[PDB]
Amino acid sequence: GARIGEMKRVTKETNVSVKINLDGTGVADNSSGIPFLDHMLDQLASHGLFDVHVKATGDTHIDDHHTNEDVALAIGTALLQALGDRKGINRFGNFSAPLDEALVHVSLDLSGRPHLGYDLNIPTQRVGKYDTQLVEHFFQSLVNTSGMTLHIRQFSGTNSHHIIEATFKAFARALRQATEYDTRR
Template sequence: MPARIASIARDTRETQIQVQINLDGTGTSDFATGVPFLDHMLDQVSRHGLIDLMVKAHGDLHIDAHHTVEDVGITLGQALDQALGDKRGVRRYGHSYVPLDEALSRVVVDLSGRPGLEYNVEYPRALIGGFDVDLLREFFQGLVNHAKITVHIDNLRGRNAHHVAETIFKAFGRALRMAVEPDPRAEGTMPSTKGSL
């Protein structure tokens, strides 16, 4: 299987984003988005997905974090799409349940070629520190739209908003790791009866 790496830059009047990804990494990460909670969540994806990930962002944080968080999701989705190539030989599907104390979340991933997000999360409060929890949906919506993948995210229980968010990102990393993993029984074949994803 060829190297599954990508480097994407996105430059708008609102944000300047750089993302580098290696799907066959060890979980090495380097983040500087200007949004510390987002950096913390991206670190969960990298470490639990064993994906090497670098994300640098400069955004209009004097307004709020919305554009930065959404555009990081978009750019990460573009990088993921590029790194996956034609998806031959991958498992395609991945799932994970992750607990953190009282919180439990489930994430299911399909490298379908079709963007779709089912996001069933109700946070116990609107802010984690100063971070608006509504932006987490925006992050995942941008990611699935541009990675062209289907992701189902369900928080099954949780009383602490930080724990809820962290279980989601850890579970996403682990589900993504499973989905992108090479399948030794399907080497070189397309995981679809249609012949393409």
């Protein structure tokens, strides 16, 4: 059976629905209210081969912060539920993903203990309309509800879009590795 986690949460500020299939085929279905975040969540599907369904509405007239945060929290919760007892999985994941001049390494452990190590140098404040401070907050919130150990280290990159997209590719491939089953155990 496919490991599926879902979370729905409605607050005064946001309305969030997420479903994730750890054993998916790369189905991307992301409409967070934040177009650049949808593009990044798409990478999680096509590079991690997860099925990622995110539908969010929120107070984006204020800014994208609350939506960005609640989507990440909900994804963390869904990821945690889909993992179940976590028996038999690789648990650790590693990947360095280039995107042209950008190169980001992600190392993670599905440990049950939240920690974010974040070392990105994003040189512009907006990619499209997306506030680039929200990248760090996305991953911080995600590790907080999933209980993940997550390290993101930038080795190269000047274009903010490239840097952020490379981060999500490496994250997706590291998370795919960590969630996959260890054939020897």
